[PDB]
Design a protein around this ligand. Sequence first.
Ligand SMILES: CC(=O)N[C@@H](Cc1ccccc1)C(=O)N[C@@H](Cc1ccc(C(F)(F)P(=O)(O)O)cc1)C(N)=O
Ligand SMILES: CCCCCCCCO[C@@H]1O[C@H](CO)[C@@H](O)[C@H](O)[C@H]1O
Length: 285
Amino acid sequence: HHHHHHEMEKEFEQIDKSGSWAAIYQDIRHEASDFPCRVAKLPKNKNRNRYRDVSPFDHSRIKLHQEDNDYINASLIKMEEAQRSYILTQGPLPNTCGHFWEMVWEQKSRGVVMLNRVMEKGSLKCAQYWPQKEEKEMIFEDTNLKLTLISEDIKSYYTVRQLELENLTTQETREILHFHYTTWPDFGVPESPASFLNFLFKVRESGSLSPEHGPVVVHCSAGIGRSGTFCLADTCLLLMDKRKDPSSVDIKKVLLEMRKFRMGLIQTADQLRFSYLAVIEGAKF
Ligand SMILES: CC(=O)N[C@@H](Cc1ccccc1)C(=O)N[C@@H](Cc1ccc(C(F)(F)P(=O)(O)O)cc1)C(N)=O
Ligand SMILES: CCCCCCCCO[C@@H]1O[C@H](CO)[C@@H](O)[C@H](O)[C@H]1O
């Protein structure tokens, strides 16, 4: 009701006018939990990690069902109250695209939400693991998978793709919905709260976040800044819809909880502010 929104808006306005995002964000960083990442740091996993400073904790990492090397830089974020799980991963490296799709298949994901661009700051921050119009069919090496591009709808702030993923061995095929938000700079904010929400609701209406499917797979370059921003906003809007009093949602507490599953979620105070703004904006709907 109007009082809940009124409180939400005033609160946001109070924090904004006083420019208090920096400190809130600082307490979150200073209080974030730290768990071991032994597997991530194993020598054999060196070229499976894009950055040495971004690793998945052991307890929540995603394990490939293979026997050779079940390691991938992806973490399982599980939010009980909100009743949603998300997989947050780094942008695939040229040598981990098979793994990426293996994980999608094994986790039974229906959707993949991409928040970065392939080239950022002059270098490859994400190998193109999906097919292009010219060569609509990709075959992934020793992961025994086949991916084909069914449709592509390029819009102003994002692109939506229908992909068909096939297990070459069993011949089972599955529909994968790819949601590429193409205008979110690394360490920056989205185009606007409205393009972001429009994007998020688009992912929601697709049925990719429902418990009928494995967890949505979300990534950016490192899988913590933008990926964390996207997931914190979704989860908070979820809690706002599930609780008797939506105004009781504790953004800092919710982000700290998510941070138990993967380090660095939300990389700048402006990304924390944007996330908050996306929630009270989305709460209207
Ligand atoms: C090869 C390698 O490991 N290089 C390191 C060197 C380094 C620099 C500064 C501090 C610590 C380590 C590196 O670049 N790490 C990056 C990792 C990183 C890159 C981008 C992001 C991100 F938010 F955009 P997103 O998760 O939205 O893709 C978050 C974290 C960094 N910290 O900026
Ligand atoms: C991410 C979105 C989080 C929304 C949480 C909003 C919590 C509102 O919090 C309320 O704001 C009022 C207005 O300043 C204050 O007067 C109340 O004391 C305070 O509890």
